[PDB]
Design a protein around this ligand. Structure first.
Ligand SMILES: [K+]
Ligand SMILES: [K+]
Ligand SMILES: [K+]
Ligand SMILES: [K+]
Ligand SMILES: [Mg+2]
Ligand SMILES: [Mg+2]
Ligand SMILES: [Mg+2]
Ligand SMILES: [Mg+2]
Ligand SMILES: [Mg+2]
Ligand SMILES: [Mg+2]
Ligand SMILES: [Mg+2]
Ligand SMILES: [Mg+2]
Ligand SMILES: [Mg+2]
Ligand SMILES: [Mg+2]
Ligand SMILES: [Mg+2]
Ligand SMILES: [Mg+2]
Ligand SMILES: [Mg+2]
Ligand SMILES: [Mg+2]
Ligand SMILES: [Mg+2]
Ligand SMILES: [Zn+2]
Lengths: 56, 82, 151, 51
RNA sequence: CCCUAACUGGAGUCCGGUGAAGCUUACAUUCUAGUGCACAGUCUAGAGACCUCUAGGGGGAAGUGAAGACCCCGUGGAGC
RNA sequence: UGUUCGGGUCGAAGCAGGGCUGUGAAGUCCUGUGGACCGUUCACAAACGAAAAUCCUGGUAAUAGUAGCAGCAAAGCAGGGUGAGACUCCCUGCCGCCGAAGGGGCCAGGUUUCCUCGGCAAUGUUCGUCAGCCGAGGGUUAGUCGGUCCUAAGACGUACCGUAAUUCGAGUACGCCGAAAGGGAAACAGGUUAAUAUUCCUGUACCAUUUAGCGUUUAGUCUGACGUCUCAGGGCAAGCCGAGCGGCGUCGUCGCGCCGUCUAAGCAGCGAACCCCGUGGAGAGCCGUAAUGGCGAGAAGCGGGCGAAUCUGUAAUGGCACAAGUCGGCUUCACCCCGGGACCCGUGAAAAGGACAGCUAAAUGUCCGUACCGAGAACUGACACAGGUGCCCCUAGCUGAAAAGGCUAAGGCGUGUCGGAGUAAUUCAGUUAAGGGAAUUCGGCAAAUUAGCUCCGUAACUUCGGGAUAAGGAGUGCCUGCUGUGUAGACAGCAGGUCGCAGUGACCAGGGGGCUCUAACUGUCUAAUACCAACAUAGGAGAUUGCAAACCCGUAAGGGCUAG
RNA sequence: UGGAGGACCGUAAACGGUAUUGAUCUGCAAAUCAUUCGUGUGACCUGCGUCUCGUAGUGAAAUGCUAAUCUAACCCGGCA
RNA sequence: UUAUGCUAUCAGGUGGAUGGCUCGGCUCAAGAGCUUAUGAAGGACGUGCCAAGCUGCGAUAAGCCCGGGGUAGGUGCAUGGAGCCAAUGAACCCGGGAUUUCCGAAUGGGACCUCUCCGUAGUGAUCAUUCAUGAUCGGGAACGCUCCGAAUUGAAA
């Protein structure tokens, strides 16, 4: 069975749900974490310095 | 906080009046107990049962059966439907 | 006429048949086109304008003639057999019917006094051992050996 | 017949009622300057990111 | 296979409808030889060549597709 | 930009074309177009000059009215409508497709695609009046169907401890979640809409909790609660046959063919096997089974208890052309009940819940889902995609071993959405082919041969299992009349007659043998060029370690192996 | 009689993917189609759930697979 | 009437360059500078007569109340129809209040369920105090402090 279009017919599920906290469809249904805002992992909002460039 | 918004007046909703039932658009946050108490306080007729459904407009519709015959007609005349 | 397709679908629902079973009168097309509700379709159905065409079954008469001949033992020769001997007559079923017939025969013979327990036991084991082809063979062995307590 | 909870169906209902044309009177009022909006879609396309 | 023939259905061919893409600096009806970065439709000297269209198989355009994966080079990498 | 001097609605900038000057970069003027800004001196600045970067962005050619709209399901025609317009939309008939899937049900997913009306610019591989398209409006009703409840593998939270620290980390303790295919309290038939219907309505039921009265533990057990293979018995949906009745078809002759002849839950009644209890006393042996078996440690026989599916009645008036509606028989999968056996170096979940003491009445039963598709057009693969998800679970008659293949129902379709025409080469896929028969070719690649079933017969070699369907031979249809086995369904066999080139007549359906290499074998693999001799395997051997072990993970706290 | 086996034949059930080096190769398809083939009671196939991942995981081991990406994935950042 | 074509100009189509305009951007300077359990920021959903997006607002939902300024119109981006409001002083602006769904630090429990379960109506976790009470939590463009800490690269390796 080809790794291309044939295996893409099994895409009848999800790995990420809608996030309560931020509204992004980034809540991992297995790890119970939002990969966008960090909901379900931290009480704070997920932010990294590498999300932008070094400001210089 | 009243759960009752207004009577639903469509063809199918008006077909209920000939079986003494009356359909309302209600607050979707409310339940059958609140709908029954709100209608009984709003018009003072005893409610036999409540049927409720949610629509694809995001509304909640409640169908109310009344105990006293002609109560649906009396409320529909008081509102101004008939 | 515009589409009578809505009326045909409604009439197939009301008649409980398939869509192509529904017959719409090609002369009463404008009468049908005015029918919007299930009550109108019911009226057209009751007045014969709309009906369900007869189901065209599969007739089975020539299969009946063949089945009668096969019951008589014909049309069933080697050039007609396609399944293995064993798919046409399973062997365990053959043994089951054979041994049950033999055992019932022996039981009735022991019951009605024609067979005492000593020879009944040996005959029962012989039947279990495939010594007799059928009830007739067992009876023939009984009469040849004179094992029946005749009176 | 997938099974939605109350909120998932509410979000689907909002997506459905967003998929409407701009009113004709809005087009008249804006003098043909507002004739569409970005939430138009078709059900048989790239699906909703809602449910 | 000798050695191919006839026939069947779908394409193709012709008609109506619909309707893309890929090569393209230019010019261009060529052929021979020579010349030239030693493999030229365009240079040189000859020989040919009235134009347009259709069908056709692919000789040529060192046809098109892809900054050769072979070889070497780089004080370039990666894995082992 | 500073500064000097100006031009412009009596027409600035820009744009198209032209005149003149300048070696030139360029400048200026003229005509048209355009409608509000533009220059100039001396200086000063810069995000300051493009033909090139397989340059970037946009626009737009040639190709070209060309390829495609064929191959895996070659499907349409007549007549009548509608409409401005009809191969393509609607009706009737005829002719077709699928018919163990292209029908039926539904998961995930989709998310309004559902229904009605009104449209046709785009979408639809053509057209279109049609439409999953466009616009407007409408549509989803539950104590009993699911979720909800329970726990599974396994997550998550808090605490503790670690960590420089944390949103990081294993373990422990306590919690909590985790199944729309596991467990599970209870509802059926009919009707109703355009679209919902075990949800609304009619009829007839049932379950749970709380309350009130009437009575109370047996309490800790059982149930929930279980693998694979195989088989008996009983039942039954579907299926089939005969008779009556009621329709339809056929009717050149005949009297056949088809359809129907119905009936839920609930309630009440009976109860097969197994098991148990009381009698009984059975061996130079008896009793059983499909089979294994059983028996003085108590067989057969005889009584009793417990205990099914289903069946019978009632619900019986509902729906049916208020047309009939009455009967029998056979079989029964692929479903239900029940019991047996065999296998395991494999042992086949848990918990909620339920039962064991409840009866009567009244009240309560909230929340979420519910439309429709479920795929050759509603999902996913950018698509109305020949893939995948799903063939996931179901399926009528004949042939036949069969759910194969063929031909037909029901149901779904003529949309695996371009048509016409019939005339070259060539081409994709097929049919046939004299005589020869592998001479072809790297190589019998491709194609052809054989083919079902019954009977006869079957070699070398062998690990004794096999080789084996070896090989090689014969038969096979139809009709008439029968025989045997069997409770039956059926199965097996015989005699005679007879037609054809041909009787497994189509469909379906091995070609066979000999000698070598290699790997023992079934199995695994380069998703998308390698299905092999490679990997694995059982077998054989070696090594470490006595458990606070060997080996291994972690920074630690602590872990895997190890419930060993 | 019995009904064992990583037993046999065989399905366009399901799974796999031999050969045609066929069709297709701006495809129906960024791996499909036809015919022909292998397994088809078991080291079987498969739904849903759940866990294991980047010098890590997974692998009956091909450097195979880990979202069309694999001799060290992907995203952003170091980075102009 | 020489077709198919070729070259130049013109007219038109297509297209959106150029010019002109700009409520936008960018940079620099001067100020000002915390907020949230009295539930923030952020998100979801709802909210308009005809309303789909954005914006505002929160079931009192393009809004409600009071004081001041303003004064004759108003009804957001966004002059359409029809109404409504406004001299009882609206709109608008400044100040102060009210309302303020669900999620979210999110905090009665649980979230592939922005909802759901118990309802004994909710002080979740860690802490201080006498045990009335109180503190901490999330957010903020950069700046600040503490701790952990690469490689490309350069050295022409
Ligand atoms: K349904
Ligand atoms: K050996
Ligand atoms: K260097
Ligand atoms: K180096
Ligand atoms: Mg891949
Ligand atoms: Mg920085
Ligand atoms: Mg060097
Ligand atoms: Mg340029
Ligand atoms: Mg067929
Ligand atoms: Mg079209
Ligand atoms: Mg409901
Ligand atoms: Mg649970
Ligand atoms: Mg054609
Ligand atoms: Mg092998
Ligand atoms: Mg090996
Ligand atoms: Mg096989
Ligand atoms: Mg970078
Ligand atoms: Mg803070
Ligand atoms: Mg260096
Ligand atoms: Zn989030």
């Amino acid at each position: 069975m080809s790794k291309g279009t044939s295996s893409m017919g099994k895409r009848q599920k999800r790995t990420h749900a809608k996030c309560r906290r931020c509204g992004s469809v980034s809540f991992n249904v297995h790890t119970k974490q939002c990969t966008s805002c960090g909901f379900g992992k931290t009480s704070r909002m997920r932010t990294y310095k590498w999300q932008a460039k070094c400001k210089y | 906080m009243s759960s009752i918004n207004y009577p639903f007046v469509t063809e199918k909703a008006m077909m209920l009046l000939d079986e003494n039932k009356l359909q309302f658009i209600v607050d979707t946050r409310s339940n059958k107990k609140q709908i029954l108490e709100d209608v009984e306080k709003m018009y003072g007729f005893k409610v036999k049962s409540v049927r409720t459904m949610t629509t694809m407009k995001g509304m909640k519709k409640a169908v109310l059966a009344f105990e006293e015959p002609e109560a649906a007609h009396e409320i529909a005349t008081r509102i101004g439907l008939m | 006429m515009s589409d009578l397709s809505n009326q045909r679908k409604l009439a197939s629902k009301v008649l409980g048949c398939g869509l192509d079973r529904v017959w719409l009168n090609p002369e009463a097309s404008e009468e049908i086109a005015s029918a919007i509700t299930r009550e109108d379709i019911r009226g057209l159905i009751e007045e014969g304008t709309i009906k369900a065409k007869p189901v065209k079954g599969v007739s089975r008469g020539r299969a009946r003639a063949l089945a009668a001949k096969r019951k008589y033992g014909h049309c069933k020769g080697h050039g007609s057999r396609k399944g293995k001997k064993g798919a046409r007559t399973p062997k365990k079923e053959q043994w089951i019917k054979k041994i049950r017939a033999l055992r019932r025969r022996l039981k009735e013979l022991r019951a009605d006094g024609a067979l005492d327990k000593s020879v009944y036991c040996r005959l029962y084991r012989k039947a279990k051992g495939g010594e007799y082809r059928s009830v007739s063979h067992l009876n023939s062995h009984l009469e040849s050996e004179k094992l029946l307590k005749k009176e | 017949m997938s099974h939605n909870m109350k909120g998932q169906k509410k979000r689907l209902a909002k997506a459905h009622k967003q998929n409407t044309r701009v009113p004709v009177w809005v087009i008249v009022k804006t003098n043909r300057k507002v004739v569409s909006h970005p939430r138009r879609r078709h059900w048989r396309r790239r699906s909703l990111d809602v449910k």
